[PDB]
Amino acid sequence: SNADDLQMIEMHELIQEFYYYALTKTVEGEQALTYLQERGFTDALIKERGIGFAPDSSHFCHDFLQKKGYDIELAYEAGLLSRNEENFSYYDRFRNRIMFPLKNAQGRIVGYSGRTYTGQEPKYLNSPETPIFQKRKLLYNLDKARKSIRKLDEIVLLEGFMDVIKSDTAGLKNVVATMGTQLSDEHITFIRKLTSNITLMFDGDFAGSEATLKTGQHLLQQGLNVFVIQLPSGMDPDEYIGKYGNDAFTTFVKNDKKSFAHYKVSILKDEIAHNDLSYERYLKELSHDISLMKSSILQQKAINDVAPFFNVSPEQLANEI
C-alpha cells in the first residue's frame, strides 16, 4: 500500500541520520571515515551525499527501528533487515559497510548501497528488490541531475554511482548510473522523456567496451542519439579525476565525444582490415546502424567518418545505406 511504502521510506530517511552520525562522529566509524577521506571525500561532500556507516553489531538498525515503533517484518520487507529462517529472528542486512543512500526520482531515500572498506565480498551490497526500490527503475543521481539533463539536452551514463558522485563534484552534473544492472527498457522510457541525447562513458576496459557496444546498439535501435566517450585503458571516471584533476576531466569529456557508429567501427578497425568475412558483415552492420540515426546532420557526418574504415567513398557507403 502507499501507506506502507511511506513507512518504508521513513525508515530509510531516519536510519540515514544515524548512519551519518556513526560515520562522522563515533569511534567505530573512524576507519571507514579515513577510507573515504583518502578517496578524496571532503566533510562537505560526505554531508552533501548523506554518506554513513553501518556498525558491525548486527542489531544497530534493528534496535533503532524497533525503538521508533516500526513493524520489524515491514523493515525486513523494506530490505533493511535480514531474517534467519531457522528461528525466524531478524538482524541488520548491512553490517560494517559504508552506506550510500539511494534516492528515487523524487529525491526520497528508498534503498542503500553498502560498500566494504576492508576488501570483503561483495564489494557493494545493495538493498534487495522492494516495493520502493527497483533496480530496473532507479537511476542513481537522477533526482539531482534532472535539471541539468534538460538544460543541457543530454544525459551521461556511467557504470558506478561512485563515478557519478565524483563526476558531479568535478562539474559534470548531468550524470547518472544504474545500480550495477544493464540499462532497462523502463530506464530508457524515462530517459527519452528528458532528452534524446545519451552519452555512454563506461570504464576503459574490455568489459566496459562490450557494455558500450551492447547498450549503445539498443539505445540506437530505440531511436536515441548515442554518443561515446572513451576513457584511457584501465580507467573509470573516478580514477581519471583522481589522476588528472577536475578541470582535466571536464575538458576530456567535452573534447572527444563520438557518435556511436563512429566509435563502433573504430573498435572493429583491425578486424575489418584483416578479415574479409568480417569486412562484409560489419559494412552491412554499420550501414544498418547509420540508417537508424534520426539526426540527418549526424547521419551524414557518421557516413563521412565511417567510410574510410572500409576504404570506400562516402558516396558508396551512402548508397549501401
Ligand X SMILES: Nc1ncnc2c1ncn2[C@@H]1O[C@H](COP(=O)(O)OP(=O)(O)OP(=O)(O)O)[C@@H](O)[C@H]1O
Rounded to a whole number of angstroms, the minimum distance from the CB of residue 110 to Mn ion is 24
C-alpha 233 chain-centroid distance: 19
Rounded to a whole number of angstroms, the minimum distance from the CB of residue 102 to ligand X is 11
What is the 8-class DSSP label of residue 308? Answer: G
Of 154, 236, 289, 305, which one interacts with Mn ion (CB under 5 A)? 236
Q: Which region, judged by CB under 5 A, interacts with Mn ion, from 144-152, 160-168, 265-273, 307-315?
A: 160-168
Report how far residue 100's alpha carbon sits from residue 85's, in angstroms, rounded to the nearest whole number.
27
What is the 8-class DSSP label of residue 155? Answer: E
Query: What stretches of 114-176 show up as alpha helix (H) in DSSP?
Result: 142-152, 161-170
Report how far residue 78's alpha carbon sits from residue 129's, in angstroms, rounded to the nearest whole number.
9
- 39 contacts 243 by C-beta, under 8 angstroms: no
Of 203, 213, 265, 286, which one interacts with Mn ion (CB under 5 A)? 203
Measured from the CB atom, is 92 or 203 closer to ligand X? 203
Residue 210 counted as an annotated binding residue: no
How are beta strands 109-115 and 124-126 bridged, if at all?
antiparallel
237 scored as a contact of Mn ion (CB under 5 A): no
- 93 contacts 80 by C-beta, under 8 angstroms: yes
Number of residues that bind Mn ion (CB under 5 A): 5
Strand (E) or helix (H) holding 20: helix 2-25
Measured from the CB atom, is 88 or 206 closer to Mn ion? 206
Measured from the CB atom, is 91 or 124 closer to ligand X? 124
Number of Cβ within 10 Å of residue 21's Cβ equals 13
Binding-site ranges for ligand X (CB under 6 A): 115, 123-124, 159-163, 180, 203, 236, 238
Q: Which region, judged by CB under 5 A, interacts with Mn ion, from 195-203, 252-260, 277-285, 303-311?
A: 195-203
What is the 8-class DSSP label of residue 205? Answer: S
Of 92, 154, 238, 305, which one interacts with Mn ion (CB under 5 A)? 238
- Contact mark string toward Mn ion, 165..184, x via CB under 5 A: --------------------
Our separate counts of H helices and E strands in the chain read: 16, 11
Query: Per the annotation, where are the binding residues for Mg(2+)?
Result: 159, 203, 205
Question: Which residues here bind Mn ion, judged by CB under 5 A?
Answer: 160, 203, 207, 236, 238
| Binding-site residue positions | 159, 203, 205
